[PDB]
Design a protein around this ligand. Structure first.
Ligand SMILES: CC(C)CCC[C@@H](C)[C@H]1CC[C@H]2[C@@H]3CC=C4C[C@@H](OC(=O)CCC(=O)O)CC[C@]4(C)[C@H]3CC[C@]12C
Ligand SMILES: CC(C)CCC[C@@H](C)[C@H]1CC[C@H]2[C@@H]3CC=C4C[C@@H](OC(=O)CCC(=O)O)CC[C@]4(C)[C@H]3CC[C@]12C
Ligand SMILES: CCCCCCCCCC(=O)N(CCO)C[C@@H](O)[C@@H](O)[C@@H](O)[C@@H](O)CO
Ligand SMILES: CCCCCCCCCC(=O)N(CCO)C[C@@H](O)[C@@H](O)[C@@H](O)[C@@H](O)CO
Ligand SMILES: CCCCCCCCCC(=O)N(CCO)C[C@@H](O)[C@@H](O)[C@@H](O)[C@@H](O)CO
Ligand SMILES: CCCCCCCCCC(=O)N(CCO)C[C@@H](O)[C@@H](O)[C@@H](O)[C@@H](O)CO
Ligand SMILES: C[C@H](CCc1ccc(O)cc1)NCCc1ccc(O)c(O)c1
Length: 286
């Protein structure tokens, strides 16, 4: 009874810490490698840095908080932080998918108008792009949450809000469909459409130099593919609940949200496809 709980609590704590460590180490490495290697200070890598910040915030704030909820079986932190924590979860996935769109659009430009790209894209503009992405993402994630537009009047929902250790994100149907479409489905569709155009236009192409560029693009394709595979299951289930709560078991819905968090750990590994990152990683770790 109490022993079963102790064994579970301690092993789950150990796993959670590992996940945190992997997400924080991996993404600090990416930021530090870029911050300190002129060869890696390209404009595309400024977008990568932004993605790494999104993932780092998941490692430092989103996951640690969720971990305490999984390990201890209740929300220990009060009402405000529960809402802030929710806000930050929506924020990061929103900022991630929006950044991935930008990366795909940056690459489409560079490949179809290399010279028009040359005269448009500067460090100053890349900064504006990044900031705009985080602005829109903040707008779409915080306000509806601070305006309580997500709340329901279901008996289930009143139960949770009248229980100080409840921090499920029980939402009304309108918000579920709206936030999913606005945070995820639309940027998803744009990203896929643009990523396929980048695929067609890369096909209409020293041989050594073009191979190295296609290796790099494939790496970006992989980042986008893995991100879709990590989050699409959660968002699909999010929709399905609006229509039928029985069609898909609870435990798998929760797990899918954790699969989403897990994506924040994957990008640094995936970047080891690149000689340059690999070398910068090995050098940084001394
Ligand atoms: C806890 C949450 C709610 C706050 C989120 C933090 C943001 C304000 C961060 C996330 C991404 C960050 C940006 C990521 C990348 C850049 C590029 C950077 O350009 C550089 O010259 C340094 C790049 C390098 O490492 O070589 C300037 C800061 C800026 C705009 C950062 C400004 C602050 C941003 C928007
Ligand atoms: C909220 C959901 C429903 C829509 C998300 C779509 C976004 C993922 C993408 C699609 C096109 C992107 C935009 C394409 C071009 C620009 C111009 C870009 O660069 C500048 O404006 C620099 C101009 C300057 O200051 O000189 C600013 C960001 C922005 C609006 C991008 C922000 C992110 C956008 C809106
Ligand atoms: C959750 C976070 C949400 C991000 C918040 C975005 C706010 C807008 C970002 C911003 O302030 N700038 C966009 C930058 O692209 C302008 C800055 O550059 C600012 O420092 C200016 O006053 C200077 O340009 C003048 O020296
Ligand atoms: C970007 C996302 C922004 C989404 C904004 C959604 C706001 C819609 C708010 C809303 O529709 N409700 C109040 C929430 O403040 C009420 C209902 O959703 C629900 O609570 C009850 O009417 C039930 O009886 C079911 O119909
Ligand atoms: C295009 C906008 C379509 C808006 C429709 C909102 C989805 C409502 C579906 C739904 O709530 N149920 C499925 C009904 O089969 C369950 C209810 O019936 C219970 O109350
Ligand atoms: C309240 C009920 C919540 C219970 C669910 C908690 C599951 C613990 C989350 C976790 O860390 N993992 C399970 C994920 O569900 C393992 C991850 O490390 C793994 O997903 C990824 O590292 C791989 O997919 C990468 O290839
Ligand atoms: C904070 C909340 C619950 C996360 C959670 C719930 C239970 C757990 O045991 C562990 C984690 N996750 C929100 C996911 C989400 C993300 C984006 C959206 O647009 C949306 O409607 C919902």
């Amino acid at each position: 009874a109490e022993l079963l709980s102790q064994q579970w609590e301690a092993g789950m704590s150990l796993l959670m810490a590992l996940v945190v460590l992997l997400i924080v180490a991996g993404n600090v490495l990416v930021i530090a490698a870029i911050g300190s290697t002129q060869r890696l200070q390209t404009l595309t890598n400024l977008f990568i840095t932004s993605l790494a910040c999104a993932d780092l915030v998941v490692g430092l704030l989103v996951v640690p908080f969720g971990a305490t909820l999984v390990v201890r079986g209740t929300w220990l932190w009060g009402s405000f932080l529960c809402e802030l924590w929710t806000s930050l979860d929506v924020l990061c996935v929103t900022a991630s998918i929006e950044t991935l769109c930008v990366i795909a659009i940056d690459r489409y430009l560079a490949i179809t108008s290399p010279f028009r790209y040359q005269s448009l894209m500067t460090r100053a503009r890349a900064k504006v792009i990044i900031c705009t992405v985080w602005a829109i993402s903040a707008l779409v994630s915080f306000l509806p949450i601070m305006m309580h537009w997500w709340r329901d009047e279901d008996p289930q929902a009143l139960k949770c809000y009248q229980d100080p250790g409840c921090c499920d994100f029980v939402t009304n149907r309108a918000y579920a469909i709206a936030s999913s479409i606005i945070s995820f489905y639309i940027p998803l569709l744009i990203m896929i459409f643009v990523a396929l155009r980048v695929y067609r236009e890369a096909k209409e192409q020293s041989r050594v130099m073009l191979m190295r560029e296609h290796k790099a693009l494939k790496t970006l394709g992989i980042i986008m593919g893995v991100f879709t595979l990590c989050w699409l299951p959660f968002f699909l289930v999010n929709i399905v609940n609006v229509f039928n709560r029985d069609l898909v078991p609870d435990w798998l819905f929760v797990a899918f949200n954790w699969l989403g968090y897990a994506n924040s750990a994957m990008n640094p590994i995936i970047y080891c496809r690149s000689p340059d990152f690999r070398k910068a990683f090995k050098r940084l770790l001394a």
